[PDB]
Amino acid sequence: TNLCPFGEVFNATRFASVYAWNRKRISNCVADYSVLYNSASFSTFKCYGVSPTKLNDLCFTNVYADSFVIRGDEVRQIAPGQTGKIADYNYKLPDDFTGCVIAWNSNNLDSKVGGNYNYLYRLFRKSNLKPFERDISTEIYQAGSTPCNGVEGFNCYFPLQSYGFQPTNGVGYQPYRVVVLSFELLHAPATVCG
Amino acid sequence: PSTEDLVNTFLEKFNYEAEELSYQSSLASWDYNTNISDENVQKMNNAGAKWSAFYEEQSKLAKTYPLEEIQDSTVKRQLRALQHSGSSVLSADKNQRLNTILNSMSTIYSTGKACNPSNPQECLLLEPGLDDIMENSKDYNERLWAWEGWRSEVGKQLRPLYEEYVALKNEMARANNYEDYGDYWRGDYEEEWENGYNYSRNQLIDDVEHTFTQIMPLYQHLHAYVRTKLMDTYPSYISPTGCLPAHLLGDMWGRFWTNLYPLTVPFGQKPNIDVTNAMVNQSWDARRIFKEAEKFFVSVGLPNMTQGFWENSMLTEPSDSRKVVCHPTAWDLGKGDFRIKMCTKVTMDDFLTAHHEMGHIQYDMAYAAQPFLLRNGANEGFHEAVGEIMSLSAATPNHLKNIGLLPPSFFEDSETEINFLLKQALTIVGTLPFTYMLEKWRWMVFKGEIPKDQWMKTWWEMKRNIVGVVEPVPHDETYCDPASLFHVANDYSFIRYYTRTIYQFQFQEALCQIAKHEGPLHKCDISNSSEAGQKLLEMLKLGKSKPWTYALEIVVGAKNMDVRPLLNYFEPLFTWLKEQNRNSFVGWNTDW
Numbered sequence: 028t029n030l031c032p033f034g035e036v037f038n039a040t041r042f043a044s045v046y047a048w049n050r051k052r053i054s055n056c057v058a059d060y061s062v063l064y065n066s067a068s069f070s071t072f073k074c075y076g077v078s079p080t081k082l083n084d085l086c087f088t089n090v091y092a093d094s095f096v097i098r099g100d101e102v103r104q105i106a107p108g109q110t111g112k113i114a115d116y117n118y119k120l121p122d123d124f125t126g127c128v129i130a131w132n133s134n135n136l137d138s139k140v141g142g143n144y145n146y147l148y149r150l151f152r153k154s155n156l157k158p159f160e161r162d163i164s165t166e167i168y169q170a171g172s173t174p175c176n177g178v179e180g181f182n183c184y185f186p187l188q189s190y191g192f193q194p195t196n197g198v199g200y201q202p203y204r205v206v207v208l209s210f211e212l213l214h215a216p217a218t219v220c221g
Numbered sequence: 222p223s224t225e226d227l228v229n230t231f232l233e234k235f236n237y238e239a240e241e242l243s244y245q246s247s248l249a250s251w252d253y254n255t256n257i258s259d260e261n262v263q264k265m266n267n268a269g270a271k272w273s274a275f276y277e278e279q280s281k282l283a284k285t286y287p288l289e290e291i292q293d294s295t296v297k298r299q300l301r302a303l304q305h306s307g308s309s310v311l312s313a314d315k316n317q318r319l320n321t322i323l324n325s326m327s328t329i330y331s332t333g334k335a336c337n338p339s340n341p342q343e344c345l346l347l348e349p350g351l352d353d354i355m356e357n358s359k360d361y362n363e364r365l366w367a368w369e370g371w372r373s374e375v376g377k378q379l380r381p382l383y384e385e386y387v388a389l390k391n392e393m394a395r396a397n398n399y400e401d402y403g404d405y406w407r408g409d410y411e412e413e414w415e416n417g418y419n420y421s422r423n424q425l426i427d428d429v430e431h432t433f434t435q436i437m438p439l440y441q442h443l444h445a446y447v448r449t450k451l452m453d454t455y456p457s458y459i460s461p462t463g464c465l466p467a468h469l470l471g472d473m474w475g476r477f478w479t480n481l482y483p484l485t486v487p488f489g490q491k492p493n494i495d496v497t498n499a500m501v502n503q504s505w506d507a508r509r510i511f512k513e514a515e516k517f518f519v520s521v522g523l524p525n526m527t528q529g530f531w532e533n534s535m536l537t538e539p540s541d542s543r544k545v546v547c548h549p550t551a552w553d554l555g556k557g558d559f560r561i562k563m564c565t566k567v568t569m570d571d572f573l574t575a576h577h578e579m580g581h582i583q584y585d586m587a588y589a590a591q592p593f594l595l596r597n598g599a600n601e602g603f604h605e606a607v608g609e610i611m612s613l614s615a616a617t618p619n620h621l622k623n624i625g626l627l628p629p630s631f632f633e634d635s636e637t638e639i640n641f642l643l644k645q646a647l648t649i650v651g652t653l654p655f656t657y658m659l660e661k662w663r664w665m666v667f668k669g670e671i672p673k674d675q676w677m678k679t680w681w682e683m684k685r686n687i688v689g690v691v692e693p694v695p696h697d698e699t700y701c702d703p704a705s706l707f708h709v710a711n712d713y714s715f716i717r718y719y720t721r722t723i724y725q726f727q728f729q730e731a732l733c734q735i736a737k738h739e740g741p742l743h744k745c746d747i748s749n750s751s752e753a754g755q756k757l758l759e760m761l762k763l764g765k766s767k768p769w770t771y772a773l774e775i776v777v778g779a780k781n782m783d784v785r786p787l788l789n790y791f792e793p794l795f796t797w798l799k800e801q802n803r804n805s806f807v808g809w810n811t812d813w
């Protein structure tokens with residue numbers, strides 16, 4: 028059994044915007060967690076629906092690693108029960124989540140002077156997302172009865188707004204990278220162990 | 222969907238874009254203030270133009286939503302605020318007209334330079350020199366010359382400009398559903414949607430006057446004291462039972478009687494606490510000043526500064542590396558970037574000033590959770606008042622002993638307390654009447670009650686009746702002395718200082734009463750009173766989300782302005798003045 032190099036999942040050239048939360052399938056390998064806390068430098072390391080390290084050397088079903096960059100103030104939004112913007116229309120964990128949530132300040136890399144406006148977030152949506160749903164659409168959010176004919180206007184706004192990350196910003200508006208580790212568990216066979 | 226749902230969508234957009242734009246503008250300006258380069262100037266202008274355009278269009282769009290159909294007041298208030306274009310309603314020709322007139326008045330005020338009545342080489346500018354003269358000179362002749370020069374050359378020019386400015390400004394107000402430009406200004410205090418909390422606009426006039434009456438006795442006795450001592454310096458011109466000549470008030474406009482302390486210093490031998498030398502001896506630095514301030518606010522319960530604050534704020538002159546504006550300024554760039562710009566120096570003055578400005582910072586740090594439109598002080602006077610209360614609590618000899626800038630067994634003597642209270646009274650109690658006078662004149666002028674033919678006439682009449690000041694030389698209607706004040710030629714409101722002053726003492730009294738402090742309010746330190754910090758925060762977090770009356774009630778326990786706190790703060794000085802005036806006259810013959 029070969030070690031699951033979360034390296035690719037955690038350390039990376041670039042991270043995707045929350046509206047495009049990237050998912051990688053951990054499988055056919057072995058992966059510890061004590062080591063992860065050992066990796067340290069993690070602002071938030073909260074695993075839900077499992078004991079702290081009772082899984083350290085245990086096996087589970089397909090493990091999915093979702094990665095995105097959000098604001099520190101929105102880090103709370105990434106948890107069962109939340110009702111914020113990021114949770115409702117960008118990424119939504121279930122009320123019975125059985126995985127992990129890891130997050131670290133990325134101000135040194137994902138921010139630049141002049142503003143790193145590359146990262147984006149969905150501001151408006153016609154209905155709340157569903158658990159682990161995604162929505163890479165780029166369509167005007169028709170607020171009222173009058174059609175929008177694909178042009179911005181009164182009660183006709185765009186649904187993907189930019190993120191202004193600058194080093195001078197405060198922690199609350201600072202870029203934090205996030206990696207959620209999905210640990211579905213059932214009698215089904217396993218490939219991820221520790 | 223309901224118009225309200227549509228509104229929420231609109232606002233939730235505006236904020237999510239306006240905030241970013243305001244941050245861009247703020248950061249570019251920080252560059253042009255922390256650095257002064259033609260480039261930075263142009264960059265600042267581009268960013269300002271984009272912010273302008275945003276607010277302009279978003280205002281028009283907000284008007285299409287109808288406030289009446291909005292029910293949640295919070296949403297209603299945000300929308301209301303955004304629905305105040307102003308200039309737009311006027312034909313763009315008239316918009317340019319008013320812009321050009323205001324720019325011309327501003328340029329006259331800035332470029333204005335008055336020359337000697339004799340020496341052709343003594344032509345000096347308004348602020349660079351004439352101010353200094355009128356603030357630290359003791360010659361009737363010289364001061365009269367400077368006074369007449371400013372209100373003649375600079376004033377007479379502005380007279381026609383202001384005559385048209387009132388017309389265009391009132392036109393704007395009426396086109397924005399306001400009876401006069403005065404009502405438009407007074408609506409800054411307007412608030413609604415509660416049981417009684419709601420304040421109307423004219424009720425501001427009512428309240429300002431019913432408070433000024435209660436302050437009048439104090440100003441009369443202070444007037445008598447000042448009149449007598451000034452008489453003993455300029456005995457050739459000061460009647461013992463009449464008004465005082467304006468050119469003798471310590472500033473070009475007689476708005477602050479602070480420079481009269483050496484001429485009106487009770488006692489005079491006794492010294493005043495000046496920890497400046499003590500700080501220099503304790504090798505304090507700019508950081509240490511601001512760190513002590515942080516510690517203070519920590520004690521009362523508020524958070525400490527953001528790491529970004531210390532990391533990006535400019536607290537010391539930029540060596541000679543850069544050219545910079547020095548006027549102390551607090552900064553809410555949005556997005557959690559809080560900063561302070563001050564050419565801090567190791568003096569008691571800068572220490573107290575830093576407390577004030579960091580108090581502004583804390584207010585801003587306390588209403589960030591609110592939406593952009595609701596992220597501001599409760600009214601136009603709440604911000605300045607909180608900063609002041611911080612400085613007023615740091616000046617107390619107690620906090621000076623605590624930080625270790627004052628000996629451990631130092632004790633105040635009644636003579637020193639009275640010196641300090643008198644200095645305070647000049648700066649505070651002296652401007653109050655002048656402030657009321659100026660703003661009442663402008664309100665009535667915009668309303669139309671004062672015709673131009675009696676436009677300067679009533680002005681000086683009012684001075685005599687209210688401020689108790691008289692014209693050294695008769696000024697016909699060709700003059701326009703009112704515009705000689707920056708806040709006037711530059712279209713600013715002037716009532717904020719009256720309100721700020723009244724409020725700050727109400728706040729301070731509440732906060733002390735919560736710290737169980739006992740004794741003269743002038744000797745109160747909220748330090749280490751977690752309860753005081755909690756009450757203050759429970760107001761500060763509100764921003765302008767809740768009615769200004771409600772914020773006040775949360776902290777002082779009333780729904781309107783009261784002067785009893787101020788009178789209590791100055792009561793010792795009041796009584797001392799009463800006795801010192803027993804053998805003189807308290808009052809002033811209007812006509813003289």
Ligand SMILES: *[C@@H]1O[C@H](CO)[C@@H](O[C@@H]2O[C@H](CO)[C@@H](O[C@@H]3O[C@H](CO)[C@@H](O)[C@H](O)[C@@H]3O)[C@H](O)[C@H]2NC(C)=O)[C@H](O)[C@H]1NC(C)=O
Nearest residue numbers: 517520521619620621622623624625745746747748749750
């Ligand atoms: C609010 O509390 C602070 C902290 O007590 C007051 O500042 C002054 O702090 C020093 C300690 O940091 C106090 O006294 C010294 O304590 C040290 C440590 O044990 C000891 O070596 C010395 O012998 C001395 O006892 C000092 O008394 C204290 N000042 C006070 C209590 O007035 C701050 O002054 C407090 N706020 C107000 C308004 O007094």
Ligand SMILES: *[C@@H]1O[C@H](CO)[C@@H](O[C@@H]2O[C@H](CO)[C@@H](O)[C@H](O)[C@H]2NC(C)=O)[C@H](O)[C@H]1NC(C)=O
Nearest residue numbers: 252255256257258259260261264539542543544
């Ligand atoms: C103040 O302004 C000057 C001139 O505008 C700035 O000088 C910059 O110097 C760097 C490095 O040589 C150039 O690449 C930049 O083009 C210059 N300015 C700008 C605006 O791009 C200077 O950096 C500014 N700030 C400070 C703190 O000195």
Ligand SMILES: *[C@@H]1O[C@H](CO)[C@@H](O)[C@H](O)[C@H]1NC(C)=O
Nearest residue numbers: 033034035037038062063066
């Ligand atoms: C890659 O990421 C893992 C995540 O735990 C970390 O432990 C490891 O040190 C990283 N390797 C680097 C940064 O070279």
Ligand SMILES: *[C@@H]1O[C@H](CO)[C@@H](O)[C@H](O)[C@H]1NC(C)=O
Nearest residue numbers: 515519520522523524525526
């Ligand atoms: C800032 O305040 C926090 C919370 O009270 C405190 O834990 C921290 O020690 C303070 N900062 C410093 C430098 O002491």
